Scaffold this active site. Structure first.
Site, short mmCIF file in Angstrom:
data_model
loop_
_atom_site.label_atom_id
_atom_site.label_comp_id
_atom_site.label_asym_id
_atom_site.label_seq_id
_atom_site.Cartn_x
_atom_site.Cartn_y
_atom_site.Cartn_z
CG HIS A 107 -1.72 -4.02 0.65
ND1 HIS A 107 -2.25 -5.14 1.30
CD2 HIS A 107 -0.66 -3.57 1.37
CE1 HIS A 107 -1.51 -5.31 2.38
NE2 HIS A 107 -0.53 -4.40 2.46
N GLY A 115 -2.38 0.73 0.96
CA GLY A 115 -1.20 0.22 1.65
C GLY A 115 0.08 0.40 0.85
CG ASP A 142 4.22 -8.83 2.82
OD1 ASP A 142 3.53 -8.25 3.71
OD2 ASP A 142 5.05 -8.23 2.11
CG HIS A 144 1.16 -6.15 5.82
ND1 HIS A 144 2.50 -5.88 5.64
CD2 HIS A 144 0.68 -5.36 6.82
CE1 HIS A 144 2.80 -4.94 6.53
NE2 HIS A 144 1.75 -4.59 7.25
CG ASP A 231 6.39 -7.10 5.60
OD1 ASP A 231 6.32 -8.30 5.23
OD2 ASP A 231 5.55 -6.22 5.27
CE1 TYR A 270 7.17 0.42 5.95
CE2 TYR A 270 8.27 -0.17 3.90
CZ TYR A 270 7.16 0.32 4.57
OH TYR A 270 6.06 0.74 3.86
N1 LIG Z 1 3.42 -5.65 2.34
C1 LIG Z 1 2.86 -4.29 2.49
C2 LIG Z 1 2.76 -3.52 1.15
C3 LIG Z 1 4.01 -3.54 0.30
C4 LIG Z 1 4.13 -4.41 -0.82
C5 LIG Z 1 5.31 -4.38 -1.61
C6 LIG Z 1 6.39 -3.54 -1.26
C7 LIG Z 1 6.29 -2.71 -0.12
CL1 LIG Z 1 7.60 -1.69 0.37
C8 LIG Z 1 5.08 -2.66 0.62
C9 LIG Z 1 3.56 -3.42 3.57
O1 LIG Z 1 4.71 -3.78 3.88
N2 LIG Z 1 3.00 -2.33 4.17
C10 LIG Z 1 1.62 -1.85 3.86
C11 LIG Z 1 0.85 -1.55 5.16
N3 LIG Z 1 1.64 -0.69 6.09
C12 LIG Z 1 1.28 0.55 6.55
O2 LIG Z 1 1.97 1.21 7.33
C13 LIG Z 1 -0.03 1.17 6.16
C14 LIG Z 1 -0.19 1.76 4.87
C15 LIG Z 1 -1.44 2.35 4.55
F1 LIG Z 1 -1.62 2.92 3.33
C16 LIG Z 1 -2.50 2.35 5.48
C17 LIG Z 1 -2.33 1.80 6.76
C18 LIG Z 1 -1.09 1.20 7.09
F2 LIG Z 1 -0.92 0.65 8.31
C19 LIG Z 1 2.94 -1.29 6.47
C20 LIG Z 1 3.73 -1.48 5.16
K LIG Z 2 0.87 -12.81 3.47
ZN LIG Z 3 3.97 -6.42 4.16
#
Ligand SMILES: N[C@H](Cc1cccc(Cl)c1)C(=O)N1CCN(C(=O)c2cc(F)ccc2F)CC1
Ligand SMILES: [K+]
Ligand SMILES: [Zn+2]
Ligand SMILES: [K+]
Length: 341
Positions: A107, A115, A142, A144, A231, A270
């Site tokens: 992100h 994110g 992923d 997202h 995820d 998670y």
């Molecule tokens: N793949 C993405 C990013 C990522 C990539 C590598 C390792 C990890 Cl550990 C995480 C992800 O898993 N996210 C980002 C978006 N999420 C949110 O809650 C969220 C976070 C925000 F700042 C704003 C709004 C939201 F809604 C859910 C969690």
């Molecule tokens: K993706």
């Molecule tokens: Zn994700």
């Protein structure tokens, strides 16, 4: 060749201190170690990224801003460095597959974090690969949309980004519709596959194989960067897709047939034990090794209770992907790819 596994106990200890994923890096590494997969790989220590290597994408002002807001700058430099090291091993011909399960922070933009991504290690890995490889295909599996990576390469036809993600109102980042195709000379060099909740292995693989087959022929990549965020796996707090590592493993196996230099990254995930189950099974896919269903005893064996098995079971939920909408999506992508040479 033998795959490169990016690891050092210092790198794992640092990643264990990350906010929403505590001890995830130790859980992943110790499960891979418990299955003795590390013996079948080349352990390479990650180098910490220098200010200049991070500045190949990020602005100096944003990097300086990251220092002032910090211990986030150190985590950022260590993860970006680990991805750059994997790209360097690939450049140097040390391997055909290089793994950094602690990367995939998709992100992050040039001068803004988002994110939970403070540095875009994937962009940094792609740029290092461009030193030897002419065309790079970035595939993002992923849950997202990999918006930061797509945005970073939106103007160029030298790097093609493909993202399969949940696309629904109020679902972060809200971007990546089938009509999002990049800009200028990079028009049609950004592919977005919008998917609804409840998707299962077979349909996901059929979608993914269908897009990648068309993408591979039109773009003809020389190297691949593959983001495999866990995820999408049934039981994740994200509570959207209904995938198992067997489905993701098939997408991975299909890509491995290309026999191109492949940089493997982690991502979201998670449910910590399910993430480790996924990435361990996927490391077994890369090594072409079948793993015993029974989790072997190790430091985190209790986290795998009450079944203590590597397999993941889909949950009871509907598949919201209508067969006609999927074909409308695939047909629109095929239309876009008519402009890709
Ligand atoms: N793949 C993405 C990013 C990522 C990539 C590598 C390792 C990890 Cl550990 C995480 C992800 O898993 N996210 C980002 C978006 N999420 C949110 O809650 C969220 C976070 C925000 F700042 C704003 C709004 C939201 F809604 C859910 C969690
Ligand atoms: K993706
Ligand atoms: Zn994700
Ligand atoms: K592009």
């Amino acid at each position: 060749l033998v795959p490169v596994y990016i690891y050092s106990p210092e790198y794992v200890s640092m990643c264990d201190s990350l906010a929403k994923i505590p001890k995830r890096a130790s859980m992943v590494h110790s499960l891979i170690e418990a299955y003795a997969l590390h013996k079948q790989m080349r352990i390479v220590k990650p180098k910490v990224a220098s200010m200049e290597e991070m500045a190949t994408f990020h602005t100096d002002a944003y990097l300086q801003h990251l220092q002032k807001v910090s211990g986030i700058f150190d985590y950022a430099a260590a993860i970006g460095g680990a991805t750059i090291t994997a790209a360097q091993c690939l450049i140097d011909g040390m391997c055909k597959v290089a793994i950094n399960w602690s990367g995939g922070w998709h992100h992050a933009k040039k001068d803004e974090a988002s994110g939970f991504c403070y540095l875009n290690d994937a962009v940094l890995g792609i740029l290092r690969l461009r030193r030897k490889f002419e065309r790079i295909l970035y595939v993002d599996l992923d849950l997202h949309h990999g918006d930061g990576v797509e945005d970073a390469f939106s103007f160029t036809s030298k790097v093609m980004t493909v993202s399969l993600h949940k696309f629904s109102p109020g679902f972060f980042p809200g971007t990546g519709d089938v009509s999002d195709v990049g800009l200028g000379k990079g028009r049609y060099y950004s592919v977005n596959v919008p998917i609804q909740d409840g998707i299962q292995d077979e349909k996901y693989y059929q979608i993914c194989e269908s897009v990648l087959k068309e993408v591979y022929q039109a773009f003809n990549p020389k190297a691949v960067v593959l983001q495999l965020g866990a995820d999408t796996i049934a039981g994740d707090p994200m509570c959207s897709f209904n995938m198992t590592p067997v489905g993701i493993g098939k997408c991975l196996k299909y890509i491995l047939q290309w026999q191109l230099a492949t940089l493997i990254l982690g991502g979201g995930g998670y449910n910590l034990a399910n993430t480790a189950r996924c990435w361990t099974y996927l490391t077994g896919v890369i090594l072409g090794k079948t793993l015993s269903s029974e989790i072997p005893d190790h430091e985190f064996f209790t986290a795998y209770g009450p079944d203590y098995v590597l397999e993941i079971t889909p949950s009871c939920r509907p598949d919201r992907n209508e067969p006609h909408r999927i074909q409308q999506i695939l047909n629109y992508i095929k239309g876009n790819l008519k402009h890709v040479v």
